[PDB]
Amino acid sequence: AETVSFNFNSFSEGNPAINFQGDVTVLSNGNIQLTNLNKVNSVGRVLYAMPVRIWSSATGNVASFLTSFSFEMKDIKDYDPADGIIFFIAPEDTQIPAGSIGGGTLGVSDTKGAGHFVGVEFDTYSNSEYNDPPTDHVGIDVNSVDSVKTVPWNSVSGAVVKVTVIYDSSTKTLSVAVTNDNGDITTIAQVVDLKAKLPERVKFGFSASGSLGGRQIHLIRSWSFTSTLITT
Amino acid sequence: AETVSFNFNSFSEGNPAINFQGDVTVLSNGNIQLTNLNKVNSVGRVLYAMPVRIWSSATGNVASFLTSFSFEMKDIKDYDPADGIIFFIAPEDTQIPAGSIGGGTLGVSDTKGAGHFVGVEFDTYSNSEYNDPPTDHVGIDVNSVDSVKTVPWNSVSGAVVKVTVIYDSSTKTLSVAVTNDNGDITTIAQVVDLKAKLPERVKFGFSASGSLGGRQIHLIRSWSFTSTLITT
Amino acid sequence: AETVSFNFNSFSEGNPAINFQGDVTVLSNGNIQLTNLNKVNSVGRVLYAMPVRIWSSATGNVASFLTSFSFEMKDIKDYDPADGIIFFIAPEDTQIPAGSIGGGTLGVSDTKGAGHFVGVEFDTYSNSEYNDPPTDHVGIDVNSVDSVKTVPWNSVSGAVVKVTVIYDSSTKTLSVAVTNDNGDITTIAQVVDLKAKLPERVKFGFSASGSLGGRQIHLIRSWSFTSTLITT
Amino acid sequence: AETVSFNFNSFSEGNPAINFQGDVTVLSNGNIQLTNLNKVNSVGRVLYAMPVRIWSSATGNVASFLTSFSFEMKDIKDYDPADGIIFFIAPEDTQIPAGSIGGGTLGVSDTKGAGHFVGVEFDTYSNSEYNDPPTDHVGIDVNSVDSVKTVPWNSVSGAVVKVTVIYDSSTKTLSVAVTNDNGDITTIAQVVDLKAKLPERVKFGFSASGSLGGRQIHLIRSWSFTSTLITT
Ligand SMILES: OC[C@H]1O[C@@H](O[C@@H]2[C@@H](O)[C@@H](O)O[C@H](CO)[C@@H]2O)[C@H](O)[C@@H](O)[C@H]1O
Ligand SMILES: OC[C@H]1O[C@@H](O[C@@H]2[C@@H](O)[C@@H](O)O[C@H](CO)[C@@H]2O)[C@H](O)[C@@H](O)[C@H]1O
Ligand SMILES: OC[C@H]1O[C@@H](O[C@@H]2[C@@H](O)[C@@H](O)O[C@H](CO)[C@@H]2O)[C@H](O)[C@@H](O)[C@H]1O
Ligand SMILES: OC[C@H]1O[C@@H](O[C@@H]2[C@@H](O)[C@@H](O)O[C@H](CO)[C@@H]2O)[C@H](O)[C@@H](O)[C@H]1O
Numbered sequence A, B, C, D: 001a002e003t004v005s006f007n008f009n010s011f012s013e014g015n016p017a018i019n020f021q022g023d024v025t026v027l028s029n030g031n032i033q034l035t036n037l038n039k040v041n042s043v044g045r046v047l048y049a050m051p052v053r054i055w056s057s058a059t060g061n062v063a064s065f066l067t068s069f070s071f072e073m074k075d076i077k078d079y080d081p082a083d084g085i086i087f088f089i090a091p092e093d094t095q096i097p098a099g100s101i102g103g104g105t106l107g108v109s110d111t112k113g114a115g116h117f118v119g120v121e122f123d124t125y126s127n128s129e130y131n132d133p134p135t136d137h138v139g140i141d142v143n144s145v146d147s148v149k150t151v152p153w154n155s156v157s158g159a160v161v162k163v164t165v166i167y168d169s170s171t172k173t174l175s176v177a178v179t180n181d182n183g184d185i186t187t188i189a190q191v192v193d194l195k196a197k198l199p200e201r202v203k204f205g206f207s208a209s210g211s212l213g214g215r216q217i218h219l220i221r222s223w224s225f226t227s228t229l230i231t232t
């Protein structure tokens, strides 16, 4: 079988295994900071440098994958804590949308909320133009920040959050488990056909953004990933 | 929210936090050995002593859970490497079936292969009486060892295996991700209505078994767990 | 620190994690066949798609690495069994030398035998023009196929060979263990200052070649690898 | 030439191939446990019964060798995690130092920290009496636990470590590659003249020890080895 697996305990600029897009920066503690606290409509994204083959046009098979990561969002003065973080999957040529206004687009869609991607978002502001739930939430996105499904969640300022995701190729289920700082877990699952919504080659990463009045610290602290694709 | 969580980097008989049933034993290295290599039709199980409330007859809500554990299986001359380990959920009064014949029942069912439980099996022998697949496999079981669904796997003697399990109550989906020695992951998912198959309070645990000629080492190395029930 | 690692039990055409150069090909059994038995001066190379930082100009630190792979060379009528395989390290922009005549250059050098790389060769033909020993041999090469050092070895047709390489940055020592067919091991060590011979970013890989009358099957069966660069 | 190779996926007492000394013991899982968690100043060692001829007084030739092994060290309440494991080579009549205080002596040296042996230590406690580095480390010892050289390492409790060692007789270099739970590899090499420090025949093995307020589980899980000496 064909397998891709890596494990970043910390990060560093200069590491060829990571592509940085937008206002991304690396703190001396090894943490990746996605947004610029002084830029309007700031957008920052990080991607696993190497493209990943999630399905084969020859066999018709689709890969399964186990991945885990931890992040943090902390408030600042005197901006509104926004907008959130999103773990996404997209075409290997994925780039920050042109004229991106950040905000609720999470740096992955256009102003209308559309884009070519699949991801799990950790939304901390309610953008009605995207039909967001009234409170903080985790959501499953398929080519849109207007989630196919969401679940109530709470973003604690300065809290270290852990996430684990499993994509069972056979059932096409994308399962997400979120462990908050206080110990409780929040989950959300949804059938998503990666073969129908994405190309054979893709890139995984994280993206975050803010607006003029909405800003906050967005940090990625760790990330492990393992995908396996059956060749016969 | 009603949350239950714990972590074991090692175990030890003497810690009431765990029930010890059957031939189970705890090795000086903190490993839980499930079966007795010298016994015939051996059966050993271990349970987290505190019963977990998976659903409320009050709210009608079902809990979600994220659990991870590592185990190890190793061959021993001159017996056929059987029968395997099963991670199960069952009534809080669960006990090894009366007059258990071990072997393919994995220590959780009667001879016909029936019992009261829900679990994930890591089967290493092909019992035809239970409709097992030709090779080693991971299966989702509901009240029977005649798995509801299975995926081809391979048990490597001496190899330390990791497993992550997610149960999303809303979609009633159980997701399993097994990390193999060669590096590949293997997944299997299945919709299982816990609230319809198990009582309000249950006990989580592990079980393993052998027969006259089928025997091997079954070890549980570690195990973390977290369940959250919405009480609103 | 910064680490790159992987493990290939088999290969496949299409995996974006690998760069194919020249007459390389992938067999139905997963093996990588480096040369084309019908071409004159055939040359095929395979490199890990992602660049590895073996040293940092900012800190001055040099990474260490551990790697193991297995290959097979099989005779074919009526050509002379040549020319062999070389595990090498080169700048990330590496390509098969323009106008390569294959043969004794092993696909990494020009006619005089010079080039920009570091590698371990498993030579099965004596090219007097490159001061080769009279018999088959394993050699440490630094910017030339005129080995810095060699040790007598023997290529057994159809035999699977296991190789282990360790690079200790502190002593700049490159150690090689080779597992013959008859069970014996052969070793060779040489001090090579990578920080002095190569750029910060390089690629790792294999290469094989042939001439008009010299041809043989060159197969790479497996490959694991891990290198770590201290970022402090 | 003259070769000696073996491989252990599991060991057992009552097996000729291996010698046991001190508090050694073999757990049901085939693992070797060196130090006894109960006794004070415990010391356990294991040796490959058949002595190996590393050099010839007739030719002057010295053998080369490649050996790999995995081990596990795990904490225990409420003792200190010490002292470590050491892979060593010594005269065929080697025995545990008379009136051994175990502990920082690793079971191979005397109180002053001296003995007849060459080895690679995996140290988890810093003994000032032997000039140890401030943190955990891997060291190359030559007739003394006051390492000829050391490298910063980190022993992770409950984790499995894979070790690779190459000895190139020609350059007299000993190279060590050690695994890390975080995916990082560590290396250390040192020129060691075996012929000068050891007799023609020796024994390879493992040794571990504990003190009064310092104990921990020391396990040897597997061990393969191959040495070849030219006899002409
Ligand atoms: O408060 C946070 C929230 O801001 C929205 O942006 C508005 C922007 O359109 C305009 O009206 O100016 C105000 C304050 O100057 C806000 O910046 C975003 O659309 C949301 O995504 C979120 O950042
Ligand atoms: O070989 C392994 C396998 O054994 C079956 O048990 C049989 C038992 O009925 C009787 O015939 O004796 C033989 C001895 O060779 C076996 O022990 C189990 O039914 C299987 O589950 C598995 O253990
Ligand atoms: O026999 C193998 C050997 O061949 C050399 O190449 C010669 C080539 O120069 C010319 O003389 O033609 C013959 C056969 O007709 C060979 O192809 C290579 O230089 C060696 O490296 C090796 O392949
Ligand atoms: O804590 C571990 C460490 O113990 C040292 O042993 C001392 C012993 O001599 C005496 O002073 O009592 C104390 C108790 O606090 C320790 O047991 C060893 O010298 C070290 O090698 C290591 O085992």
Ligand SMILES: [Ca+2]
Residues within 6 Å of the ligand: A083, A104, A123, A124, A125, A126, A127, A130, A132
């Ligand atoms: Ca929003």
Ligand SMILES: [Ca+2]
Residues within 6 Å of the ligand: B083, B104, B123, B124, B125, B126, B127, B132
């Ligand atoms: Ca079975």
Ligand SMILES: [Ca+2]
Residues within 6 Å of the ligand: C083, C104, C123, C124, C125, C126, C127, C132
């Ligand atoms: Ca040659």
Ligand SMILES: [Ca+2]
Residues within 6 Å of the ligand: D104, D123, D124, D125, D126, D127, D130, D132
């Ligand atoms: Ca010490």
Ligand SMILES: [Mn+2]
Residues within 6 Å of the ligand: A121, A123, A132, A133, A137, A139, A145, A147
């Ligand atoms: Mn949203």
Ligand SMILES: [Mn+2]
Residues within 6 Å of the ligand: B121, B123, B132, B133, B139, B145, B147
């Ligand atoms: Mn089964």
Ligand SMILES: [Mn+2]
Residues within 6 Å of the ligand: C121, C123, C132, C133, C139, C145, C147
């Ligand atoms: Mn040569």
Ligand SMILES: [Mn+2]
Residues within 6 Å of the ligand: D121, D123, D132, D133, D137, D139, D145, D147
């Ligand atoms: Mn030391």
